[PDB]
Design an enzyme around this catalytic site. Structure first.
Site, PDB file in Angstrom:
ATOM      1  N   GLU A  49       0.855  -1.189   0.000  1.00 51.55           N
ATOM      2  CA  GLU A  49       0.000   0.000   0.000  1.00 51.55           C
ATOM      3  C   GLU A  49       0.894   1.244   0.000  1.00 51.55           C
ATOM      4  OE1 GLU A  49      -1.299   1.126   4.041  1.00 51.55           O
ATOM      5  OE2 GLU A  49       0.881   1.385   3.905  1.00 51.55           O
ATOM      6  N   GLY A  50       0.519   2.270  -0.772  1.00 54.08           N
ATOM      7  CA  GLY A  50       1.307   3.514  -0.801  1.00 54.08           C
ATOM      8  C   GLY A  50       1.327   4.323  -2.114  1.00 54.08           C
ATOM      9  N   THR A  51       2.527   4.457  -2.685  1.00 54.79           N
ATOM     10  CA  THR A  51       2.789   5.255  -3.899  1.00 54.79           C
ATOM     11  C   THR A  51       1.658   5.431  -4.913  1.00 54.79           C
ATOM     12  OG1 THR A  51       4.317   3.399  -4.325  1.00 54.79           O
ATOM     13  CG2 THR A  51       5.265   5.628  -4.269  1.00 54.79           C
ATOM     14  N   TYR A  52       0.930   4.356  -5.192  1.00 54.30           N
ATOM     15  CA  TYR A  52      -0.133   4.417  -6.187  1.00 54.30           C
ATOM     16  C   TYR A  52      -1.453   3.923  -5.654  1.00 54.30           C
ATOM     17  CZ  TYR A  52       3.424   5.490  -9.647  1.00 54.30           C
ATOM     18  OH  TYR A  52       4.434   6.100 -10.357  1.00 54.30           O
ATOM     19  N   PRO A  89      15.895  -0.935  -1.464  1.00 51.96           N
ATOM     20  CA  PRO A  89      15.859  -2.384  -1.176  1.00 51.96           C
ATOM     21  C   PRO A  89      14.448  -2.966  -1.206  1.00 51.96           C
ATOM     22  CG  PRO A  89      17.326  -1.266   0.348  1.00 51.96           C
ATOM     23  CD  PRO A  89      16.601  -0.190  -0.391  1.00 51.96           C
ATOM     24  N   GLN A  90      13.475  -2.176  -0.753  1.00 51.53           N
ATOM     25  CA  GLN A  90      12.057  -2.615  -0.698  1.00 51.53           C
ATOM     26  C   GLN A  90      11.572  -3.009  -2.069  1.00 51.53           C
ATOM     27  OE1 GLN A  90       9.144   0.140   1.424  1.00 51.53           O
ATOM     28  NE2 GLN A  90      11.137   1.029   1.970  1.00 51.53           N
ATOM     29  N   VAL A  97      -3.117  -0.123  -3.795  1.00 52.68           N
ATOM     30  CA  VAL A  97      -2.876  -1.267  -2.944  1.00 52.68           C
ATOM     31  C   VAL A  97      -2.361  -2.442  -3.779  1.00 52.68           C
ATOM     32  CG1 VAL A  97      -5.343  -1.719  -3.176  1.00 52.68           C
ATOM     33  CG2 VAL A  97      -3.970  -3.029  -1.518  1.00 52.68           C
ATOM     34  N   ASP A 151       8.831  -1.880  -9.212  1.00 51.89           N
ATOM     35  CA  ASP A 151       8.272  -0.529  -8.998  1.00 51.89           C
ATOM     36  C   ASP A 151       9.049   0.610  -9.646  1.00 51.89           C
ATOM     37  OD1 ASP A 151       6.937   1.762  -8.219  1.00 51.89           O
ATOM     38  OD2 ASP A 151       6.474   1.012  -6.210  1.00 51.89           O
ATOM     39  N   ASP A 159      13.825   5.403  -8.673  1.00 54.02           N
ATOM     40  CA  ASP A 159      13.546   5.243  -7.241  1.00 54.02           C
ATOM     41  C   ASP A 159      13.951   3.894  -6.663  1.00 54.02           C
ATOM     42  OD1 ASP A 159      12.663   6.046  -4.719  1.00 54.02           O
ATOM     43  OD2 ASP A 159      10.603   5.383  -5.120  1.00 54.02           O
TER      44      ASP A 159
END
Ligand SMILES: COC(=O)[C@H](Cc1ccc(O)cc1)NC(=O)c1cc(C(=O)O)c2cc(-c3cccc(Cl)c3)ccc2n1
EC number: 2.7.11.22
Length: 278
Positions: A12-15, A122-123, A17, A137, A119
């Protein structure tokens, strides 16, 4: 979307879910990103052709209603979790070297196709049981992590280059080796200043044109550079030399992915298999 059965939320986040899902028809387990809402649809559908073993496959693009779904190849673990799991002992050098080498291969491929990640962190680097690691991503479409941001991006350069990815990868390489983030800033200026404190405040000598960057201020403090021997102990001279070239201030002097692949550090590269707990 009815063709997919959600198994569990995994992001969940940048764009939007992210869910681990099963393709009701193919039987495939995939990663399904649901983005809440012409050029985009066209560009994205294009990048779908871009295939490389070190890039997470974009399987499908499904646009419906005010929603856009991206279907990706699924991988169980990312590098950040692996780094966390390996924190006590550290990732063995041969595996750090294999991962760095593979990521440079992926980047050289992206870059030869004029595709920039922008961007890396490591994630967003996914790993599997075979010892492979893959770029994820790309921001094709929360607290923003700035740790891996190239200095030209922080200084307001609007038309930055593939060199930004090499900087990010250098930051990740150092973090794998030391088990500590290289430049963990908590704001743009703190990120910038942490870089300056370590590598020295950049000037026209080492980075021609720096004083004319949009966000450059003559009032920046002037710090002297430290030596890598202090930065990434106990990485050998081959490793430090390569890192120094990936962290050059001037984007035009920063080593390319292709040239980095030829660095002596990779003379004895191999492909070890990690011990993963899925
Ligand atoms: C750790 O969580 C993640 O990494 C999450 C969820 C996830 C989690 C597990 C997975 O296995 C997959 C996604 N990843 C994403 O949301 C995500 C987003 C994008 C994007 O730009 O919109 C993306 C683009 C390409 C791509 C592909 C080809 C060409 C180009 Cl230019 C780009 C490949 C993977 C991508 N993954």
């Amino acid at each position: 979307m009815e063709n997919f059965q959600k198994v569990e939320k995994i992001g969940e986040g940048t764009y939007g879910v992210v869910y681990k899902a099963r393709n009701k028809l193919t039987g495939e387990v995939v990663a399904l990103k649901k983005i809440r809402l012409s050029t985009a649809i066209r560009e994205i559908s294009l990048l779908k052709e871009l295939n490389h073993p070190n890039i997470v496959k974009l399987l499908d693009v499904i646009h419906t209603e005010n929603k856009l779904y991206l279907v990706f190849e699924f991988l169980h673990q990312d590098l950040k979790k692996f780094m966390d799991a390996s924190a006590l002992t550290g990732i063995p050098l041969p595996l750090i070297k294999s991962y760095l080498f593979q990521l440079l291969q992926g980047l050289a491929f992206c870059h030869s196709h004029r595709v920039l990640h922008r961007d890396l962190k490591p994630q967003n680097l996914l790993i599997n049981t075979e010892g492979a690691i893959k770029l994820a991503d790309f921001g094709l479409a929360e607290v923003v992590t700035l740790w891996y941001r190239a200095p030209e991006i922080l200084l307001g350069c609007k038309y930055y280059s593939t060199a930004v990815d090499i900087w990010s990868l250098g930051c990740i390489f150092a973090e794998m080796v030391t088990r500590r983030a290289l430049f963990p800033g908590d704001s743009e200026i703190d990120q910038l200043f942490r870089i300056f404190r370590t590598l020295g405040t950049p000037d026209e000598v080492v980075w021609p044109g720096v004083t004319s960057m949009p966000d450059y201020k003559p009032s920046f403090p002037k710090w002297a550079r430290q030596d890598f021997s202090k930065v990434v102990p106990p990485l050998d001279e081959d490793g430090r030399s390569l890192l120094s070239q990936m962290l050059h201030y001037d984007p035009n002097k920063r080593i390319s992915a292709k040239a980095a692949l030829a660095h002596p550090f990779f003379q004895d590269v191999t492909k070890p298999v990690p011990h993963l707990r899925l």
